[PDB]
């Protein structure tokens, strides 16, 4: 039985579908905000969580969640990456930005492997919620609730998989295993993100204006 | 010659003087801002500077200016540093909090050598004035002038030394050769700051705060 209906997570995924190379990701902040949060509300029981938790989970997942989205989006594209904002990206173009390192991995560890299993929106959505319902986030008022919610998402997603492909008896684990790949790609961006502010210097110590 | 004066720069240093170790520097951000902004307008020829370049220079010099200061203040004590927050850090604590590395370079490379030569407030201020007038600063509306205010300070600084101290005829150069030390410790500090953020709590990617 289900009370984390896959149909709902599908509905949520669909609801948010979109309707200098590097520098172009950064100013998109506002639309990403809306896309993350409108999506999250549409996961069952997310809204039931104490409001103060809701903030953490999103804060926590921000990266991986965005990355998970564009990767799938680009299973259309050829050796490229499509952003929520509609601009495609190419290896020569990216490497001429030092993000070649992300780009490679995005493509060879996510974009291409999703292309490979013909990953679908329900599946992607579910993995996305699993990422969201991340009970290891700091400051959760109650790690355990999130644990439970996490557990339901993957319970239904298992059941889903089995149903739709009784032949591929590994797709569920296959899916779960895209996750460390996704978590590390996220940190790798922060590493770039950070090295850029730092090395760029130029306007580098703008850490003031943290209560300054 | 005082086409750029000295005892005034002393007065300047005198004006701004005050009559868990990491946080304390991230407490006082407001005060340092106080201290630092006034001191610059009290530097001859400083305010005549275009308002825009006044800015670049405070932004660029922030760390050093601020480090040079507490270094010179801790000449006063063996084994530690004294922050403008009216508090005083110790080798054991700093180490215990994982900045022993930066802590030690300050005492070995800046305090001890400032002590060893028994540097005074005209000297201090004059080095600072140097740091403040930095032509290599990014985006100076008029840079090729800023060099002159510097040209003009070190000159005046040759004299103060030349009279007060003619037994030592390279005390001047000895003075300038602490600037590299001060850069490098300025960037080391910056590196730590970026690091701590990075291994920081999920509240690690909050850059999204740039938001435009």
């Amino acid at each position: 039985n289900e009370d984390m209906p896959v149909e709902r997570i599908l509905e949520a995924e669909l609801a948010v579908e979109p309707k200098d190379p590097v520098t172009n990701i950064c100013q998109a902040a506002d639309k990403q905000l809306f896309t993350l949060v409108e999506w999250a509300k549409r996961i069952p029981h997310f809204s039931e969580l104490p409001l103060d938790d809701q903030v953490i989970l999103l804060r926590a997942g921000w990266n991986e969640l965005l990355i998970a989205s564009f990767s799938h989006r680009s299973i259309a594209v050829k050796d490229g990456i499509l952003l929520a904002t509609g601009l495609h990206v190419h290896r020569n173009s990216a490497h001429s930005a030092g993000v070649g390192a992300i780009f490679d991995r995005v493509l060879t560890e996510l974009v291409s492997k999703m292309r490979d299993m013909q990953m679908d929106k329900t599946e992607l959505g579910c993995l996305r919620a699993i990422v969201l319902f991340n009970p290891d986030s700091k400051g959760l008022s109650n790690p355990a609730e999130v644990e439970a919610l996490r557990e339901k998402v993957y319970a239904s997603l298992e059941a889903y998989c089995k149903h739709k492909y009784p032949e591929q008896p590994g797709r569920f684990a296959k899916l779960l295993l895209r996750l460390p790949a996704l978590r590390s790609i996220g940190l790798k961006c922060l590493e770039h993100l950070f090295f850029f502010k730092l090395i760029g210097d130029t306007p580098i110590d703008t850490f003031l204006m943290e209560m300054l | 010659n005082e086409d750029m004066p000295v005892e005034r720069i002393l007065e300047a240093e005198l004006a701004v003087e005050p009559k868990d170790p990491v946080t304390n520097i991230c407490q006082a951000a407001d005060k340092q801002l106080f201290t630092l902004v006034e001191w610059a307008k009290r530097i001859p020829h400083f305010s005549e500077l275009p308002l825009d370049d006044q800015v670049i220079l405070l932004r660029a010099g922030w760390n050093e200016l601020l480090i040079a200061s507490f270094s010179h203040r801790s000449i006063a004590v063996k084994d530690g540093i004294l922050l403008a927050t009216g508090l005083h850090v110790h080798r054991n604590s700093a180490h215990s909090a994982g900045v022993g590395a930066i802590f030690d370079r300050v005492l070995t490379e800046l305090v001890s050598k400032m002590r060893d030569m028994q540097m005074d407030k005209t000297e201090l201020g004059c080095l600072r004035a140097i740091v403040l007038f930095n032509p290599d600063s990014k985006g100076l509306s008029n840079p090729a002038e800023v060099e002159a205010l510097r040209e003009k300070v070190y000159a005046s600084l040759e004299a103060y030394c030349k009279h007060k101290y003619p037994e030592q005829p390279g005390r001047f150069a000895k003075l300038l050769l602490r600037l590299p030390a001060l850069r490098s410790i300025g960037l080391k500090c910056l590196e730590h700051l970026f690091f701590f953020k990075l291994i920081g709590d999920t509240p690690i990617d909050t850059f999204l705060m740039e938001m435009l």
């Binding site: 506002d30 905000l33 809306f34 949060v37 509300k41 809204s47 409001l51 809701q54 903030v55 999103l58 804060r59 | 709590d201 509240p203 909050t206 999204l208 705060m209 938001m211």
Partner: peptide
């Protein structure tokens, strides 16, 4: 950490 983002996400549940 009551951070000026925390706030903007806070409101964002419900309106921008």
């Amino acid at each position: 950490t009551n951070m000026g983002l925390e706030a903007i996400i806070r409101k964002a549940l419900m309106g921008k």
